[PDB]
Structure formats: structure tokens, C-alpha cells
Design a protein around this ligand. Sequence first.
Ligand SMILES: NC(=O)c1ccc[n+]([C@@H]2O[C@H](COP(=O)([O-])OP(=O)(O)OC[C@H]3O[C@@H](n4cnc5c(N)ncnc54)[C@H](O)[C@@H]3O)[C@@H](O)[C@H]2O)c1
Ligand SMILES: NC(=O)c1ccc[n+]([C@@H]2O[C@H](COP(=O)([O-])OP(=O)(O)OC[C@H]3O[C@@H](n4cnc5c(N)ncnc54)[C@H](O)[C@@H]3O)[C@@H](O)[C@H]2O)c1
Ligand SMILES: NC(=O)c1ccc[n+]([C@@H]2O[C@H](COP(=O)([O-])OP(=O)(O)OC[C@H]3O[C@@H](n4cnc5c(N)ncnc54)[C@H](O)[C@@H]3O)[C@@H](O)[C@H]2O)c1
Ligand SMILES: NC(=O)c1ccc[n+]([C@@H]2O[C@H](COP(=O)([O-])OP(=O)(O)OC[C@H]3O[C@@H](n4cnc5c(N)ncnc54)[C@H](O)[C@@H]3O)[C@@H](O)[C@H]2O)c1
Ligand SMILES: Oc1cc(Cc2ccccn2)ccc1Oc1ccc(Cl)cc1Cl
Ligand SMILES: Oc1cc(Cc2ccccn2)ccc1Oc1ccc(Cl)cc1Cl
Ligand SMILES: Oc1cc(Cc2ccccn2)ccc1Oc1ccc(Cl)cc1Cl
Ligand SMILES: Oc1cc(Cc2ccccn2)ccc1Oc1ccc(Cl)cc1Cl
Lengths: 260, 268, 254, 265
Amino acid sequence: TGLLDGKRILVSGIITDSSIAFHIARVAQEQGAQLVLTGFDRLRLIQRITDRLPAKAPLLELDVQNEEHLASLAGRVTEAIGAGNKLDGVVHSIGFMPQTGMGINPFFDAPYADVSKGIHISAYSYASMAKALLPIMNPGGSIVGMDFDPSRAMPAYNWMTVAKSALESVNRFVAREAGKYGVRSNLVAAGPIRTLAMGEEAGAQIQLLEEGWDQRAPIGWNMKDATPVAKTVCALLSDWLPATTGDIIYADGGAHTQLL
Amino acid sequence: TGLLDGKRILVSGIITDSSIAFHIARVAQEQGAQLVLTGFDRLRLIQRITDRLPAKAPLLELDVQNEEHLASLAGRVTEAIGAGNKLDGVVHSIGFMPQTGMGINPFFDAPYADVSKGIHISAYSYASMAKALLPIMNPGGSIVGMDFDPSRAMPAYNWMTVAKSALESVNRFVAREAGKYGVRSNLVAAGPIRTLAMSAIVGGALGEEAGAQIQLLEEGWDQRAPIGWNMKDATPVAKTVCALLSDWLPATTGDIIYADGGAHTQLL
Amino acid sequence: TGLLDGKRILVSGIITDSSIAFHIARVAQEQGAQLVLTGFDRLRLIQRITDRLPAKAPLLELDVQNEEHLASLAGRVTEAIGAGNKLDGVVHSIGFMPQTGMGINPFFDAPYADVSKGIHISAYSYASMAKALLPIMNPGGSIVGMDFDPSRAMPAYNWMTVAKSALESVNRFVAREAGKYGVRSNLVAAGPIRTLAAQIQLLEEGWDQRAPIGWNMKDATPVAKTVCALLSDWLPATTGDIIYADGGAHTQLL
Amino acid sequence: TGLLDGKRILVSGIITDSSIAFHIARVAQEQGAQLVLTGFDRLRLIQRITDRLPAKAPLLELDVQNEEHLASLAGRVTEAIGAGNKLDGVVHSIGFMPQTGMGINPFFDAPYADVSKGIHISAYSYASMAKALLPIMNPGGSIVGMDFDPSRAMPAYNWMTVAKSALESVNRFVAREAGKYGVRSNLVAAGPIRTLAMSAIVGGEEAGAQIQLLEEGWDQRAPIGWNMKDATPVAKTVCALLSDWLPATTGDIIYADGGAHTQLL
Ligand SMILES: NC(=O)c1ccc[n+]([C@@H]2O[C@H](COP(=O)([O-])OP(=O)(O)OC[C@H]3O[C@@H](n4cnc5c(N)ncnc54)[C@H](O)[C@@H]3O)[C@@H](O)[C@H]2O)c1
Ligand SMILES: NC(=O)c1ccc[n+]([C@@H]2O[C@H](COP(=O)([O-])OP(=O)(O)OC[C@H]3O[C@@H](n4cnc5c(N)ncnc54)[C@H](O)[C@@H]3O)[C@@H](O)[C@H]2O)c1
Ligand SMILES: NC(=O)c1ccc[n+]([C@@H]2O[C@H](COP(=O)([O-])OP(=O)(O)OC[C@H]3O[C@@H](n4cnc5c(N)ncnc54)[C@H](O)[C@@H]3O)[C@@H](O)[C@H]2O)c1
Ligand SMILES: NC(=O)c1ccc[n+]([C@@H]2O[C@H](COP(=O)([O-])OP(=O)(O)OC[C@H]3O[C@@H](n4cnc5c(N)ncnc54)[C@H](O)[C@@H]3O)[C@@H](O)[C@H]2O)c1
Ligand SMILES: Oc1cc(Cc2ccccn2)ccc1Oc1ccc(Cl)cc1Cl
Ligand SMILES: Oc1cc(Cc2ccccn2)ccc1Oc1ccc(Cl)cc1Cl
Ligand SMILES: Oc1cc(Cc2ccccn2)ccc1Oc1ccc(Cl)cc1Cl
Ligand SMILES: Oc1cc(Cc2ccccn2)ccc1Oc1ccc(Cl)cc1Cl
């Protein structure tokens, strides 16, 4: 069997076992993929977390805001997979926005330094990861990022919505670069997933926002099940979406296709 | 293995071995799907074409404007697949517009009876086939139709564009109905593919503007496409369709997947 | 000044005095436009309604499904407005879908005869009116039709959503044709209005909530003014396009 | 007479008399508007330029990255228009992106410091101008920003394209804020106009020819055609958005591009 048999795939963004990346990595491993992982803050804790995947996988440090980490990344990855071997797949599952650009804090009170850091990590970094990894990627490869539909404004998401709008633009441009390698670049726009990234009058906004997805989705939406979005990322890492790039696949129960 | 191992799938739209439906069917079978084929007019001709598939598949007559072919369809399919078996997949790959609604004929000169026949067959029938077949589809199933991105106007495509716009809208409503059965409904928006569908339109536009316009439209696709586009190769779109028929896109419905080389994401 | 000072404008769609088209006509006359009106079936009743407009306006019969009505339309319009004069504007404010394609009736149970009539009246007719009228329009002119955002599916609206999706596509192509004459073609996607045309209430009440500046289903005049903005020379570079007069509801998730 | 009669409108982004903002300001004054103008850096020569406007208007220095230009903006506007008078209109016609993110420079070589500056000037500033001026705006007022359709990627526009995608997102959130004041917020997505900033994009030595093919392609795809030398159709569109005639549209985008974006070719 194995949708990803033989593929060498870099998966970023594991922080907890509820991380979307954790489930992406699990499903990928279940589908015969050979993985390499990157982690940001507390690598020791992440190692214990990543010890719970179905199989072993090298874990490397990557602070996406660090020039040196990015500069060194491709070399460190070739070490881990073996010289003369290249990546078939790259997963960007990283996002951040300071608290000030987030929930109840007034949209207008988020300082640019805070917004800029959010855009760096959640949007720009998608291009910088591509810059680093494209040199060590095989023809027919696949870059996949994580998106939340920013086409309309909403409560609480605030400046992360802007970052995702920026990220979507970046993706279309990465696709132009990636095509030179016969590599695709796409985003998976997920419904809300109960993650540790994801408070009274603001918690009221979040729940109504959440309850909306399952109501609008013709096939429903389960906030506590990360695996349909995991599967969707693997569909795109696979050879079965060979003619789609610079695009957005919506793994959201169909909520975005329905007004109510 | 087989992406579609054990799946029973209905595929409509085979007319030539260059039909998108032909290639969708070839890949499905290659991936272990058990198929039922529906064909429109010249069934003896379609049979010889479907004879070219790598595995047997019964062929059933379906004229999608014939309410009687639709009434009997679920019954005829169940006969073919076996009592107590249902479908997991359905492929709508049918389209038509009178000459009058396309190519060189002025947009304004298409009479409504023509436009309406094209809309019946190209857009409305997606709902028809879904109404007929949902009763005999399994939970986790999938309905897929073929789209050509009508979000902007363009030369020659004319009233087929208007029909695809209706198709897209119809798809969102079919998804609402299909959701009740645990079934998905989606469109694949294909880049241009060398099939025989455009033959008389392209042939009749030879010395004319819009013949040139159609050629320009086609040549610019591979230019726009960040990974390129090959009109002679229907297999990347046949795979995209198989992908939506598989269990690997389980959270997408009412939606459109673009199998066009990324062309629609690029201005130039 | 007068936003529509000296312009000759055709307005279809008036069947009652709460028709969006009645309000378009009223605001247009207040703005100095000289109108020609078209009516469908109850022409004697329609004249009674149109007498309540500020100024007079010739009323012409127009069944959009009638081939001869369409072929004579331009001649009948030019008779009305007088020799040497031409239209500067056309308002398409017509729509119909059999009950079978709407509301409570199952989406699958709408026969195609019903769907096809609805698309004939609601979408194709936008092309036929432009076909009829463009030969007697001035450059700089403007054709405007009425939309209701069909980009997402929704309860009740059903096959009329499909009709509007069709209409948006027809508009892009009408724009191609009208540009050959220096004329613009655009749609106004309006929020829901209390006009004569369970979930219906839930859906419509979402508008005011979603709209950053609110939405009043009982007030037609904001949308009428929008139509007039597009009939004017103040949007001279927009065609094949859609203007949203919905309080901004379509730009917000909740 | 006049679409904008008796309205007080701030117009930013005048650099030359070919600036889109110069034409918005000229059209607005011809329609009866009473203006306050802001200028970025060459203030002495911006004054000489704004002297070419049909009527005199106060000029205020505004650098959109400068915290105290923004903190003092409302006070300085209020002095200009006179106490107890508020604005009815605000026009954001500003944009910048460092050369690294801007043309034939490879997309991957623009440093994030360069990208962040462009996003700051071209996008965030729409929010900071709104934050500043909404407290001095009347109900029924209008904030307008300038856009170039970023829904598709393209040669040359590069990271400015990313900036515009963020700008469109920011506009939707500004509308929620503006809503509370009875004020609308919208963008005008303009077609290409021969402007000082356009010279920052094109060139490849190749600038004249790249501009020929731009004009030819745009005009061709636009059903009503397109003239890059004429900013007045886009100016009229901004004025239309500042008037009372689009009263039910916010968080939205009006395309003044000859209809090119509705057409594939
Ligand atoms: N959970 C959801 O509702 C949902 C829905 C749609 C999209 N997304 C997006 O999916 C992605 C994954 O988020 P999640 O929900 O799994 O949350 P998460 O907290 O599990 O993952 C976020 C990751 O970003 C990483 N990160 C932060 N700063 C970094 C930096 N400087 N360098 C490298 N990594 C850094 C964190 O270590 C963490 O692993 C994000 O891009 C998020 O915006 C999430
Ligand atoms: N070929 C392309 O470049 C292209 C691109 C995008 C989308 N599409 C779409 O793909 C689908 C298949 O097109 P194609 O290129 O394979 O052309 P095709 O001729 O191979 O397929 C069209 C099929 O529709 C069938 N059909 C017509 N009227 C029917 C009716 N009355 N009842 C039942 N069947 C009927 C025909 O018999 C034929 O089998 C169409 O929906 C088309 O619009 C094609
Ligand atoms: N009221 C709303 O909530 C709303 C919102 C968005 C869009 N619209 C659209 O605005 C337009 C105007 O409708 P309305 O809301 O004023 O309701 P309405 O009932 O007053 O208007 C419908 C008009 O269409 C005309 N018509 C029907 N068949 C015709 C034919 N055969 N030939 C000529 N005319 C025919 C009717 O006579 C009537 O005057 C419609 O297209 C509608 O879809 C309405
Ligand atoms: N020219 C076009 O083809 C075109 C098309 C669509 C949109 N636009 C947009 O319209 C707006 C105006 O550009 P233009 O084409 O008139 O060019 P322009 O060069 O005439 O004006 C751009 C303005 O941005 C200002 N600016 C730069 N940094 C600033 C800062 N830190 N603080 C305050 N102001 C600053 C400059 O002073 C200048 O006045 C821009 O937002 C641009 O993206 C232009
Ligand atoms: O990008 C994300 C989207 C959602 C969905 C959501 C959005 C808004 C309200 C409730 N849920 C949940 C988590 C997301 O990721 C993040 C959000 C904030 C931060 Cl700081 C970091 C991440 Cl990775
Ligand atoms: O829907 C179709 C789209 C394209 C791509 C295309 C569109 C426009 C110009 C050139 N190529 C090619 C064939 C298509 O299918 C048809 C076209 C006309 C007819 Cl009559 C029937 C079909 Cl099935
Ligand atoms: O096109 C229309 C949209 C709405 C608003 C609406 C739409 C969907 C659900 C609730 N309200 C109201 C009336 C509309 O017009 C019509 C609808 C049906 C018919 Cl038969 C005729 C018209 Cl003119
Ligand atoms: O935002 C702008 C869009 C266009 C249209 C365009 C875009 C791409 C190629 C040619 N023309 C032209 C100028 C624009 O503004 C700017 C461009 C670069 C800079 Cl550095 C600054 C501005 Cl304000």
C-alpha cells in the first residue's frame, strides 16, 4: 500500500501531540513516508513528544527567524537523510502572532513590531523555508503550508488573519520558484482544530465562530479530530494531486462553501 | 494497494479514447476500482472504446435529458453491481453546448433553446445524477464533476462559460444534499486537454479571430502554469479526480480542486 | 447639480411601489434622469404604480421571454425619447424562479422546465436586453443588473442562487459586447430587501449582524443610490463587475 | 453643484502631479471638497506641486512610520480645518517597497527587514491612519485606500503583491472599527498608471518596452480599454467612494481597471 512509500519528508511545527504537524507526521509515517522533523523552542520536550510517533525520525533545530538556522538547514537535512538523497516533501506548519494582535486586544492597539514578528513567522518564513529546501528537493516534490481562510474578517483572529492573507500571497510566489524544480507549493486551509495554539467576552466570540463550522459544513466538522486535515496534507504530498500549485485546498468540512 | 481498492464507481462521459472520462476510468481501474460505465448516444461505438480499458466494466445507456433513463438508473446500476452492493463514487464528465453558443457565433446570437439545452446537460444534470444515485451510495462516498474555470470571461467559450458558472453553483447545493448520506461532492477544474470536444468549434474558426484567440488561450496556459501544462496529457487530471474519489480528501465538499498546473493562480 | 442630469435611462422591474426598480426610478428622477420604463404583464396596474413617481415616463410592454417584444424594443424606445436621442442607461431589475426551485421545496425536486424558465428570465434576459439596447446607447453609457451574492450556497434561495451565478457569468460577457460601444456593464449585489418577491429570517437577520455599518431590510434607498452611482459618470472604469450594496456583510465571517 | 460639496477630506500620497493622489485631490476640489493634504519626505517641493491644485489647501507632514506624526495628526488636522469641524473623508494613497522585493531581484533574496518596511508603509499604515483619524471623523464618512489586485501572482510586483494582499485583509478589519463611527472603509483596485512609483517596478534598461507591453495588454483585456496616462477615471472612482452614493459598501474593493480583472484574455 502506502500513499507516501519511499518519500523523504520534512515536517515542521510539532510542539505538542495535539499539533496539526504531529498528526501530519503520524499519518505520513503510517503511509510509508520517511520523515525529518524540525522544532523551535524546547527541543528536549519535542523529542519526548516525537518519541510517540509510529517510527523514528531525526529532529533538527529550526528557529525560522534565525539566519544561521536557515543557512545551515539544507546541510543538516542531507546529513540526516544520507548524502545523494533529497527531500520529496516539505511541510510548513508554523504560526505565531503576539497576544496584542490576537483576541480581545483592540485591532488598532497592536504595534507594528508585534505585527511584523507575526508576519515574519507565519508568512515570510514560508518563502525562507522554500529558499533553503528547494535546492535539496526532487522533481515531483511538494511543499505544503497551513492556512486559515482569511478572505473575510472575523472576531479574535485579527492580525493573524492579515498574516494568513499575506501567507496566501507568498504561496503563489513560492510556486513560481518551486516550478523551476518540478516541485509544487500549496496551502491546506483547515477548519478550527483543538490545538494548544488556538477570556470571557472573547471566549464567547470563539465558541460562536467554532460552532459555525460544524453547522455550515455539509459533512460536519469535528474540532477534536486533526486527522482529516492530516490526510489532506498527505494527499498533497503525494503523486495524486500532480497538477495543482500556488493553490489552496480547503480541508474544512465544506464550511467555506456555505453561507449558513 | 490501489488508491481505489474495493471501490465501486460510476463513470459517465466516455465518447472517444481521448475523452477525459476514458482516462479517469483507466486510472481508477489501475487503482483497483470496480467500475460501471454510462454512455450517451452511439453505444456500440462507446463499447468498442470501453473495450480498450484494462478491465471489464458494464456499460449502461444514460441520456441525461431523458427522465426515463434517470428514473431507472439506480435500479440498472444495482443490477450491474449486485443487490446489496452500493457505489462509493460517481464521475460526471459530461458537457455540451450547441455551436450557436460557442466559438465564432456572436454571444448575442445564441437562441435560448440552445443555451438551455447546454445548461440542462452541462449543469442541471449534475444534480439529476446526484438525485438518482445518492440513494445507492455508501457513507464516505464521493461525487466529482468536471469544471472549466468560468470566474472570468474569455473568447469563444461563451455560453459554455455561463453553464460552468451554474455548475459550480449547483455543486454547492448537491454538497448540501450529499452531506446527509456521508457523501462528498466536488468539481475538478481542468486545464485545457486535447479531446474531441472542441473540434468543430476550432475547425470552424480557422481563418477567424477567436481561432487565434483560442490558440492564444491554450498556449498561455503552459506559460502561466508554474509547473507547466501539457494539453496532450489527460493523466494529471484523471489522477486529481481519483484523489477526490479516494479517502484522502475526506474534509472537502461543495468545492473546486484546480488541476491546471497552477495557471489560474498566476496573472502572467 | 443632479447626479444623472441630462441622461436618458431605461428601467425595467417595477411591479409594485416597493420594487427595488421603483426606488431606482424615483432616485434617478430626483437626480435629473429622464426615464423610460418597461413592464411585463399587468401594464395598467404598472402605470398606476409608476404615476406615483416624481415625473412622468413612457411605459413600454416587455416580456423578456417574448422574441417580438425584444426585436421591437429599440424602435419603441427611440419613438419614446425622440429623434436624435439615445439611451445613456439601462437597468435590468427582473427575476423569477418557480416556487419549485425555491424555499421549502427540495432542491432535487425542481424540474428542469421550471429551472430553465427561471434562468431565461433571471440570467439570459440580461444578454437579450443588452442585445436589443446597445445599438441605441451612447458611449459612456451604463447597463446595471441586480445580483444576490451566489458565491456560497444557502438555504431556501436554491435554484435562484444558481440563476444568479449564471447572471454573474452573463454580465462578464455582456461587458465584452458593451465595450465595443463604449458602454459599461455591471451588477449590484444587494443585501436582502422587504420586496414582494424559517431559515429565510435567520439568513436575512445575519446581514445586519455581519454588516460593519449595519443593514436595514426595510430600506431600499441605499441600493437604489448604488445603482445610480453606476449609471453616473463616477465609476467610468468599472465593467464586467459586481458592486456590493450589502452594508459590507459579504466581507465578514461573523 | 458638486459630488463632494461641503465635505472635509484628508488626501495623502501626493509626490508629483502625476500621483494618483494628485488627481483624487484635483477631482475632489472640482466637486466642491475642502481638503487637507499630507506629504511624506520632499515637503518643500510637495508644496510647490500642491500649488498646482485648483484651490489652496493646508499641507501637513505625515511619515507613516513615525509614531509622533501619527500621535499628533488629529490635532494638526483639527487646527487646519478649525476646532469643532471634523473630516468626512480620508484618502490613503501611499505605498513603498525596497528594490530587493520589487522587480527582477529574485523573490527569495528580499531580506525580511526590506519586506517588513514595505508591509509597514503599504499595509499596516492603512490601519494606523484609520486609528488616528476616526476620532475626528463624522458619521456617514469614508476612508479609501489604493489597491492593485493581488489575488494572482505576477512578474515584477513580487513582494509589493504580498503587501497588497495584507492591505486587503487590513481593510476588512478597518471596516469593523470604522463601522462604530458610521464610517465606511474600502479600497480602489486601480489599473496601471504612469506614476513615479511605477518607475520603481519596471526596468529589467527595458523600462519603455515593458511599459508598452503593459499598456497594450491591459487596454486589450479591459472591455472598455485602458489609458495608463490618464489617472482621472480612478480619481473619479475614489470620489464616488467618498460621496454619499455608495452608502452600503464597506470592507470592500471597487475595481477601476477598465474591467481587465473580469477577463482572462
Ligand atoms: N489549530 C487550528 O485551528 C488551525 C487551523 C487552521 C490553520 N492553522 C495553522 O496551522 C499551523 C499549525 O498550528 P497548530 O494549530 O498546530 O498550533 P501549534 O502551536 O501546535 O503549532 C504552531 C507551531 O509554530 C511553531 N513556531 C512558532 N514560532 C516559530 C519560529 N520562530 N520558528 C519555527 N517554529 C515556530 C511552534 O513551535 C509550533 O510548533 C499554523 O500555521 C496555524 O496558524 C491552525
Ligand atoms: N477537454 C478540456 O480541455 C476540458 C477542460 C475542462 C473541463 N472539461 C470538461 O470535462 C468534461 C468532459 O469533456 P471532454 O473534453 O472529455 O469532451 P468529451 O466529448 O470527451 O466528453 C463529453 C461527454 O459528454 C457526453 N454527453 C453529451 N450530451 C450528453 C447527454 N445528453 N447525456 C449523457 N451524456 C452526454 C458525451 O457523449 C461525451 O461522452 C466536460 O464537462 C467538459 O466541459 C474539459
Ligand atoms: N429584494 C431583495 O432582497 C433583492 C436582493 C438582491 C437582488 N434582488 C434582485 O433584484 C431584482 C428585482 O426584484 P425585486 O426584489 O424588486 O422584486 P420584484 O418582485 O418587485 O421584481 C421582479 C420583477 O421582475 C419582473 N419580471 C418577471 N418576469 C418577467 C418577464 N417575463 N419579463 C419582464 N419582466 C419580468 C416582474 O414583473 C417584477 O417587476 C431581481 O432580479 C432580484 O433577483 C432582490
Ligand atoms: N500607479 C499605479 O499603476 C497604481 C495602481 C494601483 C494602485 N496604486 C497604489 O496607489 C497608491 C499611490 O501610488 P502612485 O502610483 O500614485 O505613486 P506615487 O509615487 O505618485 O505616490 C506614492 C506615495 O507614497 C508615499 N509614501 C511612501 N512612503 C511613505 C511614508 N513612509 N509615509 C507617507 N507617505 C509615504 C510617497 O510620498 C508618494 O506620495 C499606492 O498605494 C499604490 O500602490 C498605484
Ligand atoms: O492560525 C490558527 C487558526 C485557528 C482557528 C481559529 C481562528 C480564530 C478563532 C478560533 N480558531 C487556531 C489556531 C491557529 O494557530 C495559531 C493562532 C495563534 C497563534 Cl499565536 C499561533 C498559532 Cl500557530
Ligand atoms: O468545457 C471544455 C473546456 C475546454 C477547454 C477550453 C476552453 C476554451 C477554449 C479552449 N479550451 C475544452 C473542452 C471542453 O468541453 C466541451 C466543450 C464544448 C462542448 Cl460542445 C462540449 C464539451 Cl464536453
Ligand atoms: O433575488 C432575490 C433575493 C432576495 C433575498 C433573499 C435571498 C435568499 C434568502 C432570503 N432572501 C429576495 C428576493 C429576490 O428576488 C426574487 C426571488 C424570487 C422570485 Cl420568484 C423573484 C424575485 Cl425578483
Ligand atoms: O502599487 C502599484 C501598482 C502599480 C501597477 C503595476 C504593477 C506591476 C507592474 C506594473 N504596474 C504601479 C505602481 C504601484 O505603486 C508602487 C509600486 C512600487 C513602489 Cl516602491 C511604490 C508604489 Cl506606491
